Amino acid sequence: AVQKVVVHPLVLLSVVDHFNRIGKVGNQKRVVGVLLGSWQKKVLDVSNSFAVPFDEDDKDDSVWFLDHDYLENMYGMFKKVNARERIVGWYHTGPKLHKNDIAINELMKRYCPNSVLVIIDVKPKDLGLPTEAYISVEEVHDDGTPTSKTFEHVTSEIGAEEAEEVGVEHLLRDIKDTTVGTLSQRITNQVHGLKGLNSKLLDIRSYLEKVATGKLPINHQIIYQLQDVFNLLPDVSLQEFVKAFYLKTNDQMVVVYLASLIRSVVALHNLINNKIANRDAEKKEG
Amino acid sequence: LLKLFTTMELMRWSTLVEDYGMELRKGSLESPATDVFGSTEEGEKRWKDLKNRVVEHNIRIMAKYYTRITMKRMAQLLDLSVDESEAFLSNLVVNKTIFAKVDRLAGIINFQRPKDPNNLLNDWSQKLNSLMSLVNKTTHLIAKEEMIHNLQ
Amino acid sequence: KIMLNTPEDVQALVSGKLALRYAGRQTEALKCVAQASKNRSLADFEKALTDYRAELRDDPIISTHLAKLYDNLLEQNLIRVIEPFSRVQIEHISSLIKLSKADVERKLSQ
């Protein structure tokens, strides 16, 4: 149904406010906020959101506390001031997906339309993208397990339309723009290996742990496609790609001729002014 | 109809000879088969151009697969002369066979292995393979990472 | 009018009773040229250039244009049979036209 979503940083800075208005009490649980957006178009666009007092139990996980009057009053007044945005779903700040999320999401599945779920981290130490759109749809399983709520990962992007780019750029004054060239390219080409190294290294360790020490079926069926796609590149002998290395290396030669020739053109004004300025300033100094 | 639908397996028409014969013999259904063969030459054109039409259509089906069926051996399995196979190639030159490769020494044909420009063909294949491995690797990795959360 | 590859109007001009009374040995060679053009044959056109060369010997300078039509149909045949054949025998492809490889090789290489 929905291919991609658009999440503005305003809601995540509202999660910064979720971490600001705590009051130093010692709970810091998965505070659930009422996510708002535009479900009209096929693409989802989050503009702003708000929160609702949400408290769980220490031992029992099935305890969840929501509010209907606060949702209808905040949504009623928010719709009165801005009717272009309506309820879409919710989101929790907890890093782990608990079992009670089917009951928490089930309320906004009954009263509200199909709600999207977003899992983020309480500490911004994760290098990866903090936002993951999880659609709440029921899927048929091939093994015969009963139909239940399944959270499929929907791709997400963090973009601002008109003003939040200006506000973020003015508040930071440290981040740089695209700036195609040497630095913005070589930084990605340096740290990219760590950007994949922390993800893969962080995932395959617990993966290999759950291979031998795993039960409660983790959908082992998708592991066959995992190792299949991993074995779709069986160390090609590079025999056919030699001519492609001749093409890319020939373009490399083109960049060699462009650099040497163009820089040789740049040497004109320098290697002329260095003489005509020094000898004339010297002969005319005294 | 199911054999003529798609994925036409290379089979002998001798099994269809008795099927068409009994198709002319039985009168319970499709009775006007003798009316199909009413004219002395029209039915012969429908039959020769029919077997020709399926013996070209199966070539158009196996032409999608690059398995290199080695039509020199296929002419032996079909039990027909290579001259009317050259006439079949005379039907392929008007059937847009321009994307093919022939051999002067041998008789094996090639429906693939073009000049293969690395900036277009290997570019496209490497794009779909590498990118497909990247995003496909991206989906079930974190998806399974969410599947293992329910075990706690 | 035969230079623009339309033999049907040639048949229309040799079938009319008006120009039929002026027919003779001259228009027969043109009927063979139009027949070879509508048949898309080459050795038949060489037969028209062989039997009628005793009315094609007094032919005007347009003989170069007729040779341009001969070489034009030859070009059509060459781009017809060679185009699907990447690598094929010269006798397997020249046997269809049953002509020597000397003139064909010279025109091709040219």
UniProtKB/Swiss-Prot annotation, chain A:
Protein's job: Component of the 26S proteasome, a multiprotein complex involved in the ATP-dependent degradation of ubiquitinated proteins. This complex plays a key role in the maintenance of protein homeostasis by removing misfolded or damaged proteins, which could impair cellular functions, and by removing proteins whose functions are no longer required. Therefore, the proteasome participates in numerous cellular processes, including cell cycle progression, apoptosis, or DNA damage repair.
Pfam families tied to this protein: JAB (PF01398), MitMem_reg (PF13012)
An annotated Gene Ontology molecular function: protein homodimerization activity
Protein's recorded name: 26S proteasome non-ATPase regulatory subunit 7
Residue intervals of the MPN domain: 5-140
Record keyword Amino-acid biosynthesis present: no
Note: Does not bind a metal ion.
Annotated GO CC locations: cytosol; extracellular exosome; extracellular region; ficolin-1-rich granule lumen; membrane; nucleoplasm; nucleus; proteasome complex
Record location of the Glycyl lysine isopeptide (Lys-Gly) (interchain with G-Cter in ubiquitin) cross-link: 176
Keyword terms: Acetylation, Isopeptide bond, Proteasome, Ubl conjugation
Entry-linked Gene3D superfamilies: Cytidine Deaminase, domain 2
Quaternary organization: Component of the 19S proteasome regulatory particle complex. The 26S proteasome consists of a 20S core particle (CP) and two 19S regulatory subunits (RP). The regulatory particle is made of a lid composed of 9 subunits including PSMD7, a base containing 6 ATPases and few additional components. Within the complex, PSMD7 interacts with subunit PSMD4 through their respective MPN domain. Interacts with TRIM5.
Upper lineage: Eukaryota, Metazoa, Chordata, Craniata, Vertebrata
Similarity field: Belongs to the peptidase M67A family.
GO biological process: proteasome-mediated ubiquitin-dependent protein catabolic process
Organism: Homo sapiens
Chain positions with N6-acetyllysine modification: 200, 210
Top-level taxon of the source organism: Eukaryota
Curated annotation (Swiss-Prot), chain B:
Residues recorded with modification N6-acetyllysine: 64
Segments forming domain PCI: 1-116
Disease involvement: Stankiewicz-Isidor syndrome: A neurodevelopmental disorder characterized by delayed psychomotor development, intellectual disability, behavioral disorders, mild dysmorphism, ophthalmologic anomalies, feeding difficulties, deafness, and variable congenital malformations of the cardiac and/or urogenital systems.
Reported function: Component of the 26S proteasome, a multiprotein complex involved in the ATP-dependent degradation of ubiquitinated proteins. This complex plays a key role in the maintenance of protein homeostasis by removing misfolded or damaged proteins, which could impair cellular functions, and by removing proteins whose functions are no longer required. Therefore, the proteasome participates in numerous cellular processes, including cell cycle progression, apoptosis, or DNA damage repair.
Family named by the database record: Belongs to the proteasome subunit p55 family.
Assembly and interaction partners: Component of the 19S proteasome regulatory particle complex. The 26S proteasome consists of a 20S core particle (CP) and two 19S regulatory subunits (RP). The regulatory particle is made of a lid composed of 9 subunits including PSMD12, a base containing 6 ATPases and few additional components. Interacts with ERCC6.
Annotated protein name in UniProt: 26S proteasome non-ATPase regulatory subunit 12
Gene name in the database record: PSMD12
Entire protein: shown range: 305 to 456 of 456
Curated annotation (Swiss-Prot), chain C:
Subcellular location(s) per record: Nucleus; Cytoplasm, Cytosol
Induction and repression of expression: By FOXO4; expression in embryonic stem cells (ESCs) is mediated by FOXO4.
Record cross-link Glycyl lysine isopeptide (Lys-Gly) (interchain with G-Cter in SUMO2), residues: 17
Domain PCI, residue spans: 1-110
Post-translational changes noted in the entry: Phosphorylated by AMPK.
Tissues/organs with expression: Highly expressed in embryonic stem cells (ESCs). Expression decreases as ESCs differentiate.
Subunit-level organization: Component of the 19S proteasome regulatory particle complex. The 26S proteasome consists of a 20S core particle (CP) and two 19S regulatory subunits (RP). The regulatory particle is made of a lid composed of 9 subunits including PSMD11, a base containing 6 ATPases and few additional components.
Function in brief: Component of the 26S proteasome, a multiprotein complex involved in the ATP-dependent degradation of ubiquitinated proteins. This complex plays a key role in the maintenance of protein homeostasis by removing misfolded or damaged proteins, which could impair cellular functions, and by removing proteins whose functions are no longer required. Therefore, the proteasome participates in numerous cellular processes, including cell cycle progression, apoptosis, or DNA damage repair. In the complex, PSMD11 is required for proteasome assembly.
Family: Belongs to the proteasome subunit S9 family.
Protein's recorded name: 26S proteasome non-ATPase regulatory subunit 11
Protein's organism: Homo sapiens (Human)
